Ligand binder design. Structure first.
Ligand SMILES: [Mg+2]
Ligand SMILES: [Mg+2]
Ligand SMILES: [Mg+2]
Ligand SMILES: [Mg+2]
Ligand SMILES: [Mg+2]
Ligand SMILES: [Mg+2]
Ligand SMILES: [Mg+2]
Ligand SMILES: [Mg+2]
Ligand SMILES: [Mg+2]
Ligand SMILES: [Mg+2]
Ligand SMILES: [Mg+2]
Ligand SMILES: [Mg+2]
Ligand SMILES: [Mg+2]
Ligand SMILES: [Mg+2]
Ligand SMILES: [Mg+2]
Ligand SMILES: [Mg+2]
Ligand SMILES: [Mg+2]
Ligand SMILES: [Mg+2]
Ligand SMILES: [Mg+2]
Ligand SMILES: [Mg+2]
Ligand SMILES: [Mg+2]
Ligand SMILES: [Mg+2]
Ligand SMILES: [Mg+2]
Ligand SMILES: [Mg+2]
Ligand SMILES: [Mg+2]
Ligand SMILES: [Mg+2]
Ligand SMILES: [Mg+2]
Ligand SMILES: [Mg+2]
Ligand SMILES: [Mg+2]
Ligand SMILES: [Mg+2]
Ligand SMILES: [Mg+2]
Ligand SMILES: [Mg+2]
Ligand SMILES: [Mg+2]
Ligand SMILES: [Mg+2]
Ligand SMILES: [Mg+2]
Ligand SMILES: [Mg+2]
Ligand SMILES: [Mg+2]
Ligand SMILES: [Mg+2]
Ligand SMILES: [Mg+2]
Ligand SMILES: [Mg+2]
Ligand SMILES: [Mg+2]
Ligand SMILES: [Mg+2]
Ligand SMILES: [Mg+2]
Ligand SMILES: [Mg+2]
Ligand SMILES: [Mg+2]
Ligand SMILES: [Mg+2]
Ligand SMILES: [Mg+2]
Ligand SMILES: [Mg+2]
Ligand SMILES: [Mg+2]
Ligand SMILES: [Mg+2]
Ligand SMILES: [Mg+2]
Ligand SMILES: [Mg+2]
Ligand SMILES: [Mg+2]
Ligand SMILES: [Mg+2]
Ligand SMILES: [Mg+2]
Ligand SMILES: [Mg+2]
Ligand SMILES: [Mg+2]
Ligand SMILES: [Mg+2]
Ligand SMILES: [Mg+2]
Ligand SMILES: [Mg+2]
Ligand SMILES: [Mg+2]
Ligand SMILES: [Mg+2]
Ligand SMILES: [Mg+2]
Ligand SMILES: [Mg+2]
Ligand SMILES: [Mg+2]
Ligand SMILES: [Mg+2]
Ligand SMILES: [Mg+2]
Ligand SMILES: [Mg+2]
Ligand SMILES: [Mg+2]
Ligand SMILES: [Mg+2]
Ligand SMILES: [Mg+2]
Ligand SMILES: [Mg+2]
Ligand SMILES: [Mg+2]
Ligand SMILES: [Mg+2]
Ligand SMILES: [Mg+2]
Ligand SMILES: [Mg+2]
Ligand SMILES: [Mg+2]
Ligand SMILES: [Mg+2]
Ligand SMILES: [Mg+2]
Ligand SMILES: [Mg+2]
Ligand SMILES: [Mg+2]
Ligand SMILES: [Mg+2]
Ligand SMILES: [Mg+2]
Ligand SMILES: [Mg+2]
Ligand SMILES: [Mg+2]
Ligand SMILES: [Mg+2]
Ligand SMILES: [Mg+2]
Ligand SMILES: [Mg+2]
Ligand SMILES: [Mg+2]
Ligand SMILES: [Mg+2]
Ligand SMILES: [Mg+2]
Ligand SMILES: [Mg+2]
Ligand SMILES: [Mg+2]
Ligand SMILES: [Mg+2]
Ligand SMILES: [Mg+2]
Ligand SMILES: [Mg+2]
Ligand SMILES: [Mg+2]
Ligand SMILES: [Mg+2]
Ligand SMILES: [Mg+2]
Ligand SMILES: [Mg+2]
Ligand SMILES: [Mg+2]
Ligand SMILES: [Mg+2]
Ligand SMILES: [Mg+2]
Ligand SMILES: [Mg+2]
Ligand SMILES: [Mg+2]
Ligand SMILES: [Mg+2]
Ligand SMILES: [Mg+2]
Ligand SMILES: [Mg+2]
Ligand SMILES: [Mg+2]
Ligand SMILES: [Mg+2]
Ligand SMILES: [Mg+2]
Ligand SMILES: [Mg+2]
Ligand SMILES: [Mg+2]
Ligand SMILES: [Mg+2]
Ligand SMILES: [Mg+2]
Ligand SMILES: [Mg+2]
Ligand SMILES: [Mg+2]
Ligand SMILES: [Mg+2]
Ligand SMILES: [Mg+2]
Ligand SMILES: [Mg+2]
Ligand SMILES: [Mg+2]
Ligand SMILES: [Mg+2]
Ligand SMILES: [Mg+2]
Ligand SMILES: [Mg+2]
Ligand SMILES: [Mg+2]
Ligand SMILES: [Mg+2]
Ligand SMILES: [Mg+2]
Ligand SMILES: [Mg+2]
Ligand SMILES: [Mg+2]
Ligand SMILES: [Mg+2]
Ligand SMILES: [Mg+2]
Ligand SMILES: [Mg+2]
Ligand SMILES: [Mg+2]
Ligand SMILES: [Mg+2]
Ligand SMILES: [Mg+2]
Ligand SMILES: [Mg+2]
Ligand SMILES: [Mg+2]
Ligand SMILES: [Mg+2]
Ligand SMILES: [Mg+2]
Ligand SMILES: [Mg+2]
Ligand SMILES: [Mg+2]
Ligand SMILES: [Mg+2]
Ligand SMILES: [Mg+2]
Ligand SMILES: [Mg+2]
Ligand SMILES: [Mg+2]
Ligand SMILES: [Mg+2]
Ligand SMILES: [Mg+2]
Ligand SMILES: [Mg+2]
Ligand SMILES: [Mg+2]
Ligand SMILES: [Mg+2]
Ligand SMILES: [Mg+2]
Ligand SMILES: [Mg+2]
Ligand SMILES: [Mg+2]
Ligand SMILES: [Mg+2]
Ligand SMILES: [Mg+2]
Ligand SMILES: [Mg+2]
Ligand SMILES: [Mg+2]
Ligand SMILES: [Mg+2]
Ligand SMILES: [Mg+2]
Ligand SMILES: [Mg+2]
Ligand SMILES: [Mg+2]
Ligand SMILES: [Mg+2]
Ligand SMILES: [Mg+2]
Ligand SMILES: [Mg+2]
Ligand SMILES: [Mg+2]
Ligand SMILES: [Mg+2]
Ligand SMILES: [Mg+2]
Ligand SMILES: [Mg+2]
Ligand SMILES: [Mg+2]
Ligand SMILES: [Mg+2]
Ligand SMILES: [Mg+2]
Ligand SMILES: [Mg+2]
Ligand SMILES: [Mg+2]
Ligand SMILES: [Mg+2]
Ligand SMILES: [Mg+2]
Ligand SMILES: [Mg+2]
Ligand SMILES: [Mg+2]
Ligand SMILES: [Mg+2]
Ligand SMILES: [Mg+2]
Ligand SMILES: [Mg+2]
Ligand SMILES: [Mg+2]
Ligand SMILES: [Mg+2]
Ligand SMILES: [Mg+2]
Ligand SMILES: [Mg+2]
Ligand SMILES: [Mg+2]
Ligand SMILES: [Mg+2]
Ligand SMILES: [Mg+2]
Ligand SMILES: [Mg+2]
Ligand SMILES: [Mg+2]
Ligand SMILES: [Mg+2]
Ligand SMILES: [Mg+2]
Ligand SMILES: [Mg+2]
Ligand SMILES: [Mg+2]
Ligand SMILES: [Mg+2]
Ligand SMILES: [Mg+2]
Ligand SMILES: [Mg+2]
Ligand SMILES: [Mg+2]
Ligand SMILES: [Mg+2]
Ligand SMILES: [Mg+2]
Ligand SMILES: [Mg+2]
Ligand SMILES: [Mg+2]
Ligand SMILES: [Mg+2]
Ligand SMILES: [Mg+2]
Ligand SMILES: [Mg+2]
Ligand SMILES: [Mg+2]
Ligand SMILES: [Mg+2]
Ligand SMILES: [Mg+2]
Ligand SMILES: [Mg+2]
Ligand SMILES: [Mg+2]
Ligand SMILES: [Mg+2]
Ligand SMILES: [Mg+2]
Ligand SMILES: [Mg+2]
Ligand SMILES: [Mg+2]
Ligand SMILES: [Mg+2]
Ligand SMILES: [Mg+2]
Ligand SMILES: [Mg+2]
Ligand SMILES: [Mg+2]
Ligand SMILES: [Mg+2]
Ligand SMILES: [Mg+2]
Ligand SMILES: [Mg+2]
Ligand SMILES: [Mg+2]
Ligand SMILES: [Mg+2]
Ligand SMILES: [Mg+2]
Ligand SMILES: [Mg+2]
Ligand SMILES: [Mg+2]
Ligand SMILES: [Mg+2]
Ligand SMILES: [Mg+2]
Ligand SMILES: [Mg+2]
Ligand SMILES: [Mg+2]
Ligand SMILES: [Mg+2]
Ligand SMILES: [Mg+2]
Ligand SMILES: [Mg+2]
Ligand SMILES: [Mg+2]
Ligand SMILES: [Mg+2]
Ligand SMILES: [Mg+2]
Ligand SMILES: [Mg+2]
Ligand SMILES: [Mg+2]
Ligand SMILES: [Mg+2]
Ligand SMILES: [Mg+2]
Ligand SMILES: [Mg+2]
Ligand SMILES: [Mg+2]
Ligand SMILES: [Mg+2]
Ligand SMILES: [Mg+2]
Ligand SMILES: [Mg+2]
Ligand SMILES: [Mg+2]
Ligand SMILES: [Mg+2]
Ligand SMILES: [Mg+2]
Ligand SMILES: [Mg+2]
Ligand SMILES: [Mg+2]
Ligand SMILES: [Mg+2]
Ligand SMILES: [Mg+2]
Ligand SMILES: [Mg+2]
Ligand SMILES: [Mg+2]
Ligand SMILES: [Mg+2]
Ligand SMILES: [Mg+2]
Lengths: 146, 97
RNA sequence: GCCCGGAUAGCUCAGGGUAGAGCAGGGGAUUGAAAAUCCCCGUGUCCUUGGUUCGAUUCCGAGUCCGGGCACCA
RNA sequence: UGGGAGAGGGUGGUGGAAUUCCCGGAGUAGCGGUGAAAUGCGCAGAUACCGGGAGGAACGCCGAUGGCGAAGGCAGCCAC
RNA sequence: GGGCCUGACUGCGAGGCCUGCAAGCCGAGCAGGGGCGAAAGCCGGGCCUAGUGAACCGGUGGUCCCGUGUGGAAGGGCCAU
RNA sequence: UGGUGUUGGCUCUUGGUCGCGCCUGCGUAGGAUAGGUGGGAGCCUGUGAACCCCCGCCUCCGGGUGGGGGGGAGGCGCCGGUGAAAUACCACCCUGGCGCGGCUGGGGGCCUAACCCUCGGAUGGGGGGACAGCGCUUGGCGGGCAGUUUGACUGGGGCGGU
RNA sequence: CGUAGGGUUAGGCGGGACCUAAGGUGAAGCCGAAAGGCGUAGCCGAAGGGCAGCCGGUUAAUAUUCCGGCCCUUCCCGCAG
RNA sequence: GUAGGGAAACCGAGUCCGAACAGGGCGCAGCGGCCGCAAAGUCCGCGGCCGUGGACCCGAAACCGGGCGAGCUAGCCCUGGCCAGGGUGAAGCUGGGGUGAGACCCAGUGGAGGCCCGAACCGGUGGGGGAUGCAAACCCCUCGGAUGAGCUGGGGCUAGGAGUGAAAAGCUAACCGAGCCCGGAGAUAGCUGGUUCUCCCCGAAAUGACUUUAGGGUCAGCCUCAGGCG
RNA sequence: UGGUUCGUGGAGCCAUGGGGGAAUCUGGGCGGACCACCGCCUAAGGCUAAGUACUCCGGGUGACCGAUAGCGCACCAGUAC
RNA sequence: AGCCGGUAGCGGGCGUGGAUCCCUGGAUGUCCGAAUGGGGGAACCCGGCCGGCGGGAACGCCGGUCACCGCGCGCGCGGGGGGAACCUGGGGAACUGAAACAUCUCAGUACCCAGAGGAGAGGAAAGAGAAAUCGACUCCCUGAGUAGCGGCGAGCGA
């Protein structure tokens, strides 16, 4: 008897997988414990309706990240800081970089989504990895000048 | 055993025919009937307990139509069955037949 | 009729490369006897036929005879 | 009055050896029994071996030419 | 008693015996293909009279007659047992 | 009482058939452990040989064999001796093995959730448990019950005889 | 016996507006081709439980029933505690 | 009806069996002068007999279905009631005796018991009577039980292959080896009985064969009628 | 297993208590086992007058009865008993 | 033009201003009965609720209402029971016949039950069956005692 697993299970199959079980197992264990559902045609395409709705909401977000990847690797964030020859007096933090990004180029950015542990204390040119969604890591070239 | 609530199957009267002798198709003189008498054939009735709208419902149904019960449980999801008596839940469920 | 099998020394029980063993029998040993026991000795187309093989208890086929087993009977 | 030895008796407990049966395991062509045999038991797996269990009866060594009791009779060990 | 043989035939059968029916019995002669005999001829078991069982149901060999729209087939019929 | 339905989960050990893998096969004659046949003068070996340690092994007790640690130009065939039958390699197979995979069927242990019982408390707890019960089907026992049969002749009927 | 007329008077007697027994019926529920069979509660069900009237007189015919005498029960409303 | 023969295919005044042009089976067919009558055949009426129906009428013992009965009787359930009077004198208890203590013995008290005698009540042993009875089980005398496995009132439950039964196949509404009523139903009866006006002619049989047949049948024999023959 | 003329028969068809269990016209059922060919028809939802049966009731009519007949009842009968 | 039933009589009345009587509709319609407020040994008994009557609170009477089940979104609508035969469906004998008897017959009859209605069933092809055909069902004649079925018996029978 074909059923739709509603959870991963012991040597049975992954969630959403359609598996064949003895009818007794389905009627008196899986179904009354919400662990699965009989693969009737009605809620059988309701499965592919979801495999469609999620796959549309995933590929969407892997697209709305490229709409920042190509829009960030085609600029530079130049940040002025009062600094003596090399060393910044204050610093530039993630929040600073974000605040400066929305300042000049309007781009809004999650500073916690930016890979920078210690605040920058040196002048120079920096390339900092941004992660707005994995497998789309952005290389932001930033320029702390004086 | 009475009546399938789903299919309507009820006991039927059948004969029990006792035969002797070698069938003609095996080279015998033929079969002879040493007795016919009435008997009954019963549906393979079983209980099916399901839980619908937080109530327990029991069906007396022939094994053949056990699948038809859960099919009603599916079709009952689009119904507003809360607060109804278990007896009234059954009536509604059977209405979808 | 059909299936399953047998047949091997007088009796019986075993068995591709042997014709076996026990029991009955013969003599000897033994006792007081009846024996038990001990040694040796015998007693076969292995049912018949045809073929397989270098060879036939074997393997196959065909009869025969007797076992089994099963069903039917106007 | 103070002591002693003792299977003297009765009641309630309790210990180990052995037999038999039962279950598990391992194993195979005989076991048993006698003057010799036979009946009996064993390939439906006995005998012999190991482990587990149940149950009843009798108390090995000490133990003796011993002890105690009126006699009959009294023997594992413990308390009364 | 012996020699050769298979008529212990096939396809029929005039006419009778007997007889409630059904059965039972005798049978010349014609054809086919034979046996014995030189031939005339004889031979359709046995000197004779007991040694037997209607029909139904089924088996087997043959026939190729029927074959449920059609060709086949299943299953029947017919002859023999 | 078998099969099957209601009837499910996890294990363990099995048997039967199917396909493939590697073998096992030693009466006597003789190198030795010769399946049956056929092919065929080359198979091999740095794509690790002649020797030492582990064994799966099966041993008929003589041996056959593989993978491992050995190992760093060696092997055994045609040749032949007695064979019904030459030995290498290949190949299809016989009678058996086991290894894997397939369909399977058998048992045994456990689980709980169907089903059953039970719990003043019940969408629960406890016990039994895929057994039992119940459906369909198989064969069997079956005067408890049912329908019947149980001949005629005959110096009456039975008995006897026929 | 035929025709006709008359005659049976209860808050307290007996039963009901009270209780339950076997049993019957039976919301819940269970079962059965149909008819129907079960079934806890509940309801019904008495010669059992419970509950307030004794004596006398009177009629042709009733009387613990009418009358007389002396007693008593429940319900309703009110007053008092 | 006009065509039959063959298991059939099929052929056809033929056909089947067969090798047959053999044999055999079964088939094939008007009066007198084109006109009449008669006739194949068929239709309707009438009569005899036969088949199917209850089939000439009456009669079982029985079988089956659906109901009605435990106001009789049998058992059980619930709730009530009844058993005069007399007799016997268990245990225990008390006291006395007894003994180491006891067992035990004696007396008194006590009032047990499917105990005794006997009415009511419940029975029904023997005899007599009764026998178209007083009575479809009674009467007289006698006799059994009578605190019990006792009797009895009222309220209930169990029934037909079923109940109930201290068991007799007893009882289940005056006959129970399977109740009663209605129905299937006009069951069936090879048996027994019965079968109705008149006259005239003829006139049997009681044997054979076969028969779950023997006092019943089929055929033959023997009777009768119609047509034909002579 | 039942239905049909079909009693297991060569046993199809129609129905279905049990087990297994599809497809949507290039799908499916039938034409008497089965196969091929050739045809017929579209299952697993329902409704549908009329022609047909009967006679409690009304009328019409009898080569129907005429009080033991005709209904059990001509009448105060489903009564008396 | 007579009348107050069968039914005369006593005693009293009515009718051409149309009686009696006949047809239709209406009103009344105790109690029981499917019986339905509850109970019950049918025609009896006992209640709740609203309203009324009496002097009326107790008590009683009068009118209305109050069973259960199903269906529809407390309210509505429907069901219940009866009917001589007839009809359909669910169950379903035996005597008898086979001159015994079991398959078979009687017979899907008798009968029980449920249901329906003036009828009921059936009905618009997943049909027939051999015609290159027909064209729902029902009913009558015929086909036909045919085809077949059958201890190939008795019989049954499209
Ligand atoms: Mg900063
Ligand atoms: Mg049967
Ligand atoms: Mg055949
Ligand atoms: Mg038969
Ligand atoms: Mg038969
Ligand atoms: Mg039966
Ligand atoms: Mg059930
Ligand atoms: Mg279930
Ligand atoms: Mg559940
Ligand atoms: Mg099914
Ligand atoms: Mg199924
Ligand atoms: Mg002292
Ligand atoms: Mg053991
Ligand atoms: Mg022995
Ligand atoms: Mg042995
Ligand atoms: Mg063995
Ligand atoms: Mg013991
Ligand atoms: Mg001494
Ligand atoms: Mg001679
Ligand atoms: Mg000679
Ligand atoms: Mg010659
Ligand atoms: Mg000849
Ligand atoms: Mg002749
Ligand atoms: Mg003759
Ligand atoms: Mg005759
Ligand atoms: Mg003769
Ligand atoms: Mg000649
Ligand atoms: Mg000649
Ligand atoms: Mg010559
Ligand atoms: Mg000549
Ligand atoms: Mg001749
Ligand atoms: Mg001679
Ligand atoms: Mg016969
Ligand atoms: Mg024949
Ligand atoms: Mg043949
Ligand atoms: Mg032909
Ligand atoms: Mg056909
Ligand atoms: Mg054909
Ligand atoms: Mg062809
Ligand atoms: Mg042809
Ligand atoms: Mg043939
Ligand atoms: Mg034939
Ligand atoms: Mg034949
Ligand atoms: Mg079974
Ligand atoms: Mg199972
Ligand atoms: Mg377990
Ligand atoms: Mg288990
Ligand atoms: Mg559990
Ligand atoms: Mg558990
Ligand atoms: Mg539970
Ligand atoms: Mg539980
Ligand atoms: Mg549990
Ligand atoms: Mg089971
Ligand atoms: Mg089966
Ligand atoms: Mg059986
Ligand atoms: Mg018997
Ligand atoms: Mg009997
Ligand atoms: Mg009996
Ligand atoms: Mg029995
Ligand atoms: Mg009997
Ligand atoms: Mg007989
Ligand atoms: Mg006789
Ligand atoms: Mg006689
Ligand atoms: Mg005599
Ligand atoms: Mg005589
Ligand atoms: Mg005499
Ligand atoms: Mg005489
Ligand atoms: Mg005799
Ligand atoms: Mg008087
Ligand atoms: Mg009076
Ligand atoms: Mg008073
Ligand atoms: Mg009152
Ligand atoms: Mg009362
Ligand atoms: Mg009460
Ligand atoms: Mg109910
Ligand atoms: Mg019932
Ligand atoms: Mg009841
Ligand atoms: Mg009760
Ligand atoms: Mg009350
Ligand atoms: Mg009552
Ligand atoms: Mg009462
Ligand atoms: Mg009372
Ligand atoms: Mg009282
Ligand atoms: Mg009173
Ligand atoms: Mg007083
Ligand atoms: Mg007085
Ligand atoms: Mg008086
Ligand atoms: Mg007084
Ligand atoms: Mg007074
Ligand atoms: Mg003919
Ligand atoms: Mg011919
Ligand atoms: Mg001719
Ligand atoms: Mg001729
Ligand atoms: Mg004429
Ligand atoms: Mg006559
Ligand atoms: Mg006649
Ligand atoms: Mg008749
Ligand atoms: Mg007649
Ligand atoms: Mg009978
Ligand atoms: Mg009988
Ligand atoms: Mg009855
Ligand atoms: Mg009754
Ligand atoms: Mg009584
Ligand atoms: Mg009584
Ligand atoms: Mg009574
Ligand atoms: Mg009493
Ligand atoms: Mg008394
Ligand atoms: Mg007294
Ligand atoms: Mg007394
Ligand atoms: Mg006394
Ligand atoms: Mg005294
Ligand atoms: Mg006294
Ligand atoms: Mg005393
Ligand atoms: Mg006392
Ligand atoms: Mg004393
Ligand atoms: Mg004293
Ligand atoms: Mg005393
Ligand atoms: Mg006394
Ligand atoms: Mg007494
Ligand atoms: Mg006495
Ligand atoms: Mg006395
Ligand atoms: Mg006396
Ligand atoms: Mg008496
Ligand atoms: Mg008596
Ligand atoms: Mg008397
Ligand atoms: Mg006397
Ligand atoms: Mg007398
Ligand atoms: Mg008398
Ligand atoms: Mg008397
Ligand atoms: Mg007297
Ligand atoms: Mg007296
Ligand atoms: Mg007396
Ligand atoms: Mg007396
Ligand atoms: Mg007394
Ligand atoms: Mg007495
Ligand atoms: Mg007493
Ligand atoms: Mg008593
Ligand atoms: Mg009493
Ligand atoms: Mg009583
Ligand atoms: Mg009484
Ligand atoms: Mg009873
Ligand atoms: Mg009863
Ligand atoms: Mg009876
Ligand atoms: Mg009866
Ligand atoms: Mg009985
Ligand atoms: Mg008694
Ligand atoms: Mg009576
Ligand atoms: Mg009577
Ligand atoms: Mg009686
Ligand atoms: Mg009697
Ligand atoms: Mg009887
Ligand atoms: Mg009877
Ligand atoms: Mg009788
Ligand atoms: Mg009676
Ligand atoms: Mg009567
Ligand atoms: Mg009746
Ligand atoms: Mg009737
Ligand atoms: Mg009849
Ligand atoms: Mg009749
Ligand atoms: Mg009669
Ligand atoms: Mg009879
Ligand atoms: Mg007779
Ligand atoms: Mg008579
Ligand atoms: Mg007469
Ligand atoms: Mg005359
Ligand atoms: Mg004369
Ligand atoms: Mg004669
Ligand atoms: Mg005669
Ligand atoms: Mg006879
Ligand atoms: Mg006789
Ligand atoms: Mg006789
Ligand atoms: Mg006579
Ligand atoms: Mg007779
Ligand atoms: Mg005659
Ligand atoms: Mg004559
Ligand atoms: Mg004459
Ligand atoms: Mg004549
Ligand atoms: Mg004449
Ligand atoms: Mg003359
Ligand atoms: Mg039929
Ligand atoms: Mg059939
Ligand atoms: Mg049939
Ligand atoms: Mg058929
Ligand atoms: Mg079908
Ligand atoms: Mg089915
Ligand atoms: Mg198509
Ligand atoms: Mg298709
Ligand atoms: Mg079909
Ligand atoms: Mg089909
Ligand atoms: Mg077909
Ligand atoms: Mg068709
Ligand atoms: Mg068609
Ligand atoms: Mg259609
Ligand atoms: Mg249809
Ligand atoms: Mg209609
Ligand atoms: Mg119309
Ligand atoms: Mg119509
Ligand atoms: Mg009329
Ligand atoms: Mg009239
Ligand atoms: Mg007339
Ligand atoms: Mg007349
Ligand atoms: Mg009269
Ligand atoms: Mg009359
Ligand atoms: Mg007269
Ligand atoms: Mg008359
Ligand atoms: Mg009338
Ligand atoms: Mg009348
Ligand atoms: Mg009369
Ligand atoms: Mg009369
Ligand atoms: Mg009257
Ligand atoms: Mg007057
Ligand atoms: Mg006047
Ligand atoms: Mg006028
Ligand atoms: Mg006028
Ligand atoms: Mg007018
Ligand atoms: Mg009116
Ligand atoms: Mg009422
Ligand atoms: Mg009532
Ligand atoms: Mg009021
Ligand atoms: Mg007043
Ligand atoms: Mg008032
Ligand atoms: Mg008032
Ligand atoms: Mg009132
Ligand atoms: Mg009221
Ligand atoms: Mg009713
Ligand atoms: Mg109605
Ligand atoms: Mg009917
Ligand atoms: Mg019917
Ligand atoms: Mg019917
Ligand atoms: Mg019956
Ligand atoms: Mg029958
Ligand atoms: Mg019968
Ligand atoms: Mg009979
Ligand atoms: Mg008949
Ligand atoms: Mg008969
Ligand atoms: Mg007869
Ligand atoms: Mg008889
Ligand atoms: Mg019969
Ligand atoms: Mg029958
Ligand atoms: Mg009949
Ligand atoms: Mg029938
Ligand atoms: Mg009728
Ligand atoms: Mg009409
Ligand atoms: Mg209609
Ligand atoms: Mg249509
Ligand atoms: Mg048609
Ligand atoms: Mg057409
Ligand atoms: Mg059409
Ligand atoms: Mg039309
Ligand atoms: Mg015709
Ligand atoms: Mg038939
Ligand atoms: Mg028949
Ligand atoms: Mg038939
Ligand atoms: Mg019939
Ligand atoms: Mg028909």
């Amino acid at each position: 008897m074909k059923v739709i697993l509603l959870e991963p299970l012991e040597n049975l199959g992954d969630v959403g997988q359609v598996v064949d079980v003895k009818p007794g197992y389905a009627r008196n264990y899986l179904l009354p414990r919400g662990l699965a559902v009989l693969a009737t045609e009605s809620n059988l395409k309701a499965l592919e309706a979801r495999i469609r709705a999620q796959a549309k909401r995933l590929a969407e977000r892997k697209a709305e990240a490229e709409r920042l990847k190509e829009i960030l690797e085609n600029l530079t964030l130049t940040i002025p800081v009062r600094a003596g020859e090399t060393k910044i007096y204050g610093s530039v933090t993630a929040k600073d970089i974000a605040e400066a990004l929305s300042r000049q180029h309007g781009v809004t950015i999650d500073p916690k989504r930016l890979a920078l542990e210690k605040p920058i204390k040196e002048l120079g040119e920096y390339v900092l990895t941004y992660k707005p969604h994995p497998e789309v890591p952005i290389q932001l070239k930033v320029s702390v000048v004086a | 055993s009475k009546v399938c609530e789903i299919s309507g199957k009820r006991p039927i009267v059948a004969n029990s025919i006792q035969r002797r002798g070698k069938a003609k198709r095996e080279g015998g003189v033929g079969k002879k009937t040493t007795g016919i008498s009435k008997r009954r054939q019963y549906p393979n009735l079983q209980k099916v307990r399901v839980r619908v709208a937080g109530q327990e419902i029991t069906f007396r149904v022939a094994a053949s139509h056990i699948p038809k019960v859960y099919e009603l449980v599916e079709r009952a999801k689009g119904l507003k069955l809360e607060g109804l008596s278990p007896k009234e839940i059954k009536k509604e469920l059977l209405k979808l037949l």
